[PDB]
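The freezer alarm interrupted the setup, so I double-checked each line after restarting. Inputs confirmed:
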Amino acid sequence: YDLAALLAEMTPENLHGETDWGALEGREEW
Amino acid sequence: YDLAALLAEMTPENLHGETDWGALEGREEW
Amino acid sequence: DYVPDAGHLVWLNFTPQAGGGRRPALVLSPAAYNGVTGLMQACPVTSRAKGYPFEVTLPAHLGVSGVVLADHCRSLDWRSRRAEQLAEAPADVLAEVRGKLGSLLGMS
Amino acid sequence: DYVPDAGHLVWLNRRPALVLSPAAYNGVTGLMQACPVTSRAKGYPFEVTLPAHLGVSGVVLADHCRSLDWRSRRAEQLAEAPADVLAEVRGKLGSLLGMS
Amino acid sequence: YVPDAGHLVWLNFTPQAGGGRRPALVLSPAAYNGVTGLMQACPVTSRAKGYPFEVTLPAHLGVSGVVLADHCRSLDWRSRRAEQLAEAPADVLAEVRGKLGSLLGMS
Amino acid sequence: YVPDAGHLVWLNRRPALVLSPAAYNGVTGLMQACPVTSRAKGYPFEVTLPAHLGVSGVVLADHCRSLDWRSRRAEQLAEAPADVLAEVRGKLGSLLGMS
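Predicted 3D structure, all chains:
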């Protein structure tokens, strides 16, 4: 998969915000 | 000038063919 | 008893710090690693399919609605988050997620 | 202002991190893929040692790579990782992700 | 006459088998052009298609067409009878060089 | 085959060093490349190719040009070392007024 080809398909309307996984759990460093 | 941004604007319709400078002249290597 | 393995679709909890839910995720890391760290690398499944290039669609026969966000891969503690297997993604889904994510990470 | 690029070592939140995704993705999305840096080197399998006098010390935890919003965490460049460190992190993480 | 960077020049071309004259933008400096008889130049074409390497020429220069920045080529300006037509402004030259340098992988 | 940046290629036949990347070369059928010659004279824009690379001579950095590589049936010979590619780009960039 060519990265430039992927990035060329991004648009302001199809962006996703950061996925919320809530608070830090267990052995997670961050 | 970012190359990927430039290449993302190319299309089959706006491509230019090789520019014809005719026969080799003078000190030209090719 | 369950240890998540690569290609599993799992339920995973998340809990707010201040007064959350459960969301499916696709596991990319193998059980060998997942079982000696209690962690896994997994990509979230979102209900919002927008045509974003890192979305990977899930076949209807698996029964899991939504798309995988390949670029949202994250290390998560699957014990604390009570991972529960839902399904197993076919090899071509896993390959598309890994190909898109690997491209983003600069893998050669 | 600043947009993190691949190989940058950044401050985040307060803690250092190694950025793996490139500025062309990071700037448009406000997200990046990055691995955290810790001073608690234990010699466990996915640690990658940072060379001395780089401007930041410790190990990169290659297996803790994650997507995160770097604007809300106010990313700030610290240094640039040597190519061999970046290549070792990518090798270990790629194996972990099933990428061969 | 020795062509210099930023000059727009007429340049001949002649078919091998039984051609014409076309404007070109010179990128290399006279110091080089005068010790080799060669120059690096980009052709001006009448066909403006919106191709990303096209660089438009301001109307006040009087030269119709657009410069193809990615079509830069080493040409013998003595044999091809280079004749100065105009001088491109600095911002035109900078756009041609920026687009061409990007294509060539200049850092 | 699509030539990529740093490739040394046969072209209609003589060797050449490709400077433009495959993402441009494949879509356009064109490339920017410098010719290779065995006639090293030590003149200012020559870049020497190391021995045992698969092709010998010097790259003539000042003779870079756009050309149709499909009609000339480009064929890969080798890959130039990074230092040769960087030296060609440095000399050509100076010649083109790019600092």
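Quick read of the result. Residues 61 and 75 of chain D are 18 Å apart (CA to CA).
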